[PDB]
Amino acid sequence: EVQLQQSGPELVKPGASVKISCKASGYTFTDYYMNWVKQSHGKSLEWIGNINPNNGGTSYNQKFKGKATLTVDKSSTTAYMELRSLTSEDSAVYYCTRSPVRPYYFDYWGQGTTLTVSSAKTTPPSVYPLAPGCGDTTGSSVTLGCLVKGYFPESVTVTWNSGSLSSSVHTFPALLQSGLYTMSSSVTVPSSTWPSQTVTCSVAHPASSTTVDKKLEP
Amino acid sequence: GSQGERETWGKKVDFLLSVIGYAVDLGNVWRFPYICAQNGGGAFLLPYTIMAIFGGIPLFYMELALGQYHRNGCISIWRKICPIFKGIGYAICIIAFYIASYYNTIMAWALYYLISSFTDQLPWTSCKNSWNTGNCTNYFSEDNITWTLHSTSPAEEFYTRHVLQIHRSKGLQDLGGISWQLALCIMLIFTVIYFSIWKGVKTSGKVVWVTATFPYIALSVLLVRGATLPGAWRGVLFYLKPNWQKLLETGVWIDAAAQIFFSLGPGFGVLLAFASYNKFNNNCYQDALVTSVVNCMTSFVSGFVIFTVLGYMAEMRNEDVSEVAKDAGPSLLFITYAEAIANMPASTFFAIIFFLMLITLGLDSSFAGLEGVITAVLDEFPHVWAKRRERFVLAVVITCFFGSLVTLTFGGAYVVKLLEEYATGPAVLTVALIEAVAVSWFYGITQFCRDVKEMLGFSPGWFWRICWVAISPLFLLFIIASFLMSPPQLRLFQYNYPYWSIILGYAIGTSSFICIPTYIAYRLIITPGTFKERIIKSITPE
Amino acid sequence: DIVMTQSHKFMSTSVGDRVSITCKASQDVSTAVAWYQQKPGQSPKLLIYSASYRYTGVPDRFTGSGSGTDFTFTISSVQAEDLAVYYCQQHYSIPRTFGGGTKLEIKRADAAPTVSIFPPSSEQLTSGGASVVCFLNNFYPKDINVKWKIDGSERQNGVLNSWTDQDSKDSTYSMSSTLTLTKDEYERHNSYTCEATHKTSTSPIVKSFNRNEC
Ligand SMILES: CC(C)CCC[C@@H](C)[C@H]1CC[C@H]2[C@@H]3CC=C4C[C@@H](O)CC[C@]4(C)[C@H]3CC[C@]12C
Ligand SMILES: CN(C)CCC[C@@]1(c2ccc(Br)cc2)OCc2cc(C#N)ccc21
Ligand SMILES: *[C@@H]1O[C@H](CO)[C@@H](O)[C@H](O)[C@H]1NC(C)=O
Ligand SMILES: *[C@@H]1O[C@H](CO)[C@@H](O)[C@H](O)[C@H]1NC(C)=O
Ligand SMILES: CCCCCCCCCCCC
Ligand SMILES: CCCCCC
């Protein structure tokens, strides 16, 4: 049950600093190196550096020297990474991963941390439901969906009926325009469950911390 | 008269090999390969020679000529040059007393390893022992094993918790008490150096025959052995891989300068004493040249001997030769190299010849290190001493033994690092700077070239004269200034030294040469007349 | 430093086929190489470590081999949940570096896209805007044309095409074409049409709706 639980997403203006944590569990925390890997959007993995939790001995990368600072807390068994002088290149998904001394591999990774460095104001999303028309032909299955428009930065989570049931759900990647993201989602449910039961889409924006839920009415 | 003249050498080859045996030691075997690999790789060969030719060779030859000319010890030779600097000959003595406190205990470790190598199964192979912990994980064990931050190897456990027993001390604060086994080993070594000295330069030239020649045979056997090991090309690649961006850093040149200076070991009066017994018409130039070249090339082949085995070790592990070579010090020989020996066929043989090689590497250098001081005091106090030479030699050996008891404790290694880096080194460089300044700028370089013109029949060339006038004193001055400006941070065995360590080493370093300034004040206050006349009798020889 | 070079940025394979990915390093690596699997939207997962050896919790269908600069990661039976991005990494020398990555796309038979057009909701009409949606679900391959018609006329303005990642169940791509317009322009037109041209059939699939109370 080895689990590394990182912090949530972060939106910060350029020139500021940001700190990301890592909560380790399921293993002896003093036995392993803690690491951080930066993954840029569409790019490959990049090793930042490791730290020895016993003495906190830090080993960085020449590319990241003077960029990232690693710390560790043995009381809570929690590792920290701090970044200063933030630019647009620093926007990426960061991970904290456990590694042994040898052979050196990353066995367990954190869920990841989405970082966005921009001066754009945090914009609450607009949630508009998409309801099939009353003139459509109802077949063996009907397709519903919900729309999200005008939010920044990219952090959004759209669920359906508290997670039950999505086996058909298709989610469309977000598109950035005029500094605001826009995306949409759809689901294919049989004609026997609609509109008999209650099907409601939930849109959560952790950056603005705004959760708006909308139910589909034909 | 009561005593007319002193002794001489039994054969040219005896002292020719005696100065070489003095100059060849452990540092040539280990210290040079590591500093060569981490700085510039093979490109480190360029600055290493420049600091030799310009810095090292003129100090070795200038130090070697005065001994064969004046034929006096490290003390009495200053009475004939600059009496106020006579304290130098005393400072070296005190300096020697510090150096003998550690340098022998290393051979004591190698001896405890040698007597433990007579078992069919070597102790650092298996993890089942009285001294091993639960972290011990060895090979010929379950596969798939992954190393842990707290895990340790059976060789690391054997050196750490058994022979050194460093787990029993918390640091410099509490290092007590003393280990009796290493006390017995260092007693056997102080006994084997006693019988190679007490009879004078007669035995010290005869015993050198075995101690100087054996390390080359052992290095040949270990070279043919390491060359046949698979994956040995990784350590040779990491060893010779040129990095030319390192020469731009001002540090690597200082590292090469200090390395060649300490490797040749001039200005300590040992070469002065070895040259003191020799023919007057004998050639100094060819001697110093050949000996220095033999030392440097010995380090060069030692690099291959080390890095073939470390390349095989990086092949058995996964590459990155810097990772297995991370630790710089005795742990490279006593843990890494030893653990690499335990995994090879006829491991008892290659272990015995290895540790015996180490002991023979230190023994001759100890013979000469004591020989310079004994010659210095015997020549400084003649006929009040020399009543028996074995009496004075024994009186020095026992004093060195009681001085090495601080090093024989459980925390002795910390005292080794502290004394070597923070105390003995800067004071040897300092006294060597005082000698290089005194011979050139006081007795004069022109009269020195005239003395060389008397012994060799011809005056030394302008290349050497311009080196003694300028290049050499600035060559030592650069090293001393570099150390004093930024003393390095000391670390050993996952333990960082306290901030006050530099205060202690300096306190031990300064206390060695306290004698020269107070002696200058002694002759300055003793000599009557004007201070210019006192400094005139001090500048003019007696 | 060390450069891990993956020459193939994309590789195609079919369910059940034997697939292999090559990893070219800078210098001689000996046996030290690690193969990681990162699924879309997930953290990387360690699969292979130190040439042939497998980490715990890794199925038998994943293998690896090679000793040298070049290494090979081999999958015998490819499943639908095996769709992910694979990375190779050298753990010997500091710093540790990764390859460019190889995205493994699954090849299967063609599928007819299901197209569904949707009118703007009243909640969006309260805010003064309207958007007609065109959904394309369960098709293959990714390449498909989408043409919009407001009334009888091709509308190329205000159209956004979004292609998702390949599916981990039936391995079928899905895309969305969005038409965003003002409310004033939305109330001046009635029947909207969106069509899609794919390689499964020569006739583009056409969907239409009426603006007046469906
Ligand atoms: C050989 C003689 C002349 C050297 C003496 C110099 C003195 C001042 C130096 C040498 C050793 C030093 C001490 C080494 C040990 C300790 C213990 C530590 O918990 C406090 C610092 C302290 C107390 C140091 C204080 C300064 C010190 C006492
Ligand atoms: C290669 N050379 C350095 C060997 C000489 C060793 C050394 C020595 C002295 C006394 C005794 Br007992 C044994 C050896 O001669 C001069 C010197 C300076 C330092 C320092 N710092 C160290 C060692 C010596
Ligand atoms: C192994 O080492 C760790 C620290 O290095 C120590 O806490 C532990 O007690 C050791 N194991 C045993 C069995 O002593
Ligand atoms: C592989 O090594 C790890 C070391 O932590 C160990 O936990 C694991 O059990 C080993 N694998 C097997 C199959 O024993
Ligand atoms: C590399 C230096 C070997 C000798 C160490 C002696 C300690 C003093 C060194 C001063 C210059 C670094
Ligand atoms: C300048 C050196 C000072 C040393 C004090 C013990």
Side-chain angles (χ1 to χ4, degrees), chain B residues 31 35 254-255 258-259 262 420-427 429 479-480 482-484 488:
Chain B
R31 211 152 192 169
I35 195 180
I254 304 168
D255 294 18
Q259 177 63 25
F262 281 93
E420 185 170 29
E421 195 116 15
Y422 278 178
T424 62
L429 275 154
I479 309 174
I480 276 288
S482 176
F483 172 79
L484 295 179

Side-chain angles (χ1 to χ4, degrees), chain B residues 143 233-234 318-319 323, chain C residues 27-31 53 92:
Chain B
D143 201 341
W233 62 267
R234 302 184 183 274
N318 278 326
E319 218 179 332
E323 301 300 309
Chain C
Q27 68 188 38
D28 179 274
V29 203
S30 179
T31 52
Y53 293 96
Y92 64 108

Side-chain angles (χ1 to χ4, degrees), chain A residues 32 98 105, chain B residues 142-148, chain C residues 49 54-56:
Chain A
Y32 297 93
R98 194 194 80 174
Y105 52 73
Chain B
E142 55 178 357
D143 201 341
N144 118 289
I145 62 271
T146 71
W147 206 265
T148 320
Chain C
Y49 79 103
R54 313 181 183 97
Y55 193 70
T56 61

Side-chain angles (χ1 to χ4, degrees), chain B residues 270-305:
Chain B
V270 163
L271 315 171
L272 203 80
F274 271 178
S276 175
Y277 316 90
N278 217 17
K279 312 174 65 62
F280 194 89
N281 261 88
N282 180 85
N283 181 278
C284 306
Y285 193 89
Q286 180 183 5
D287 293 27
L289 195 148
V290 168
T291 60
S292 302
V293 177
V294 164
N295 171 80
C296 294
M297 301 300 286
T298 305
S299 302
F300 186 73
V301 293
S302 304
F304 293 91
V305 177

Side-chain angles (χ1 to χ4, degrees), chain C residues 1-5 24-29 69 90 92 97:
Chain C
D1 291 24
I2 307 307
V3 177
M4 308 300 290
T5 300
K24 177 187 300 180
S26 72
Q27 68 188 38
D28 179 274
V29 203
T69 61
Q90 54 90 6
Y92 64 108
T97 57

Side-chain angles (χ1 to χ4, degrees), chain B residues 319 321-340:
Chain B
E319 218 179 332
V321 196
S322 175
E323 301 300 309
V324 69
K326 260 183 171 178
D327 203 333
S331 304
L332 201 150
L333 299 180
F334 284 103
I335 299 182
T336 301
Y337 206 99
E339 181 171 62

Side-chain angles (χ1 to χ4, degrees), chain A residues 14 29 102 108 157:
Chain A
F29 182 77
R102 167 175 61 255
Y108 303 96
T157 304

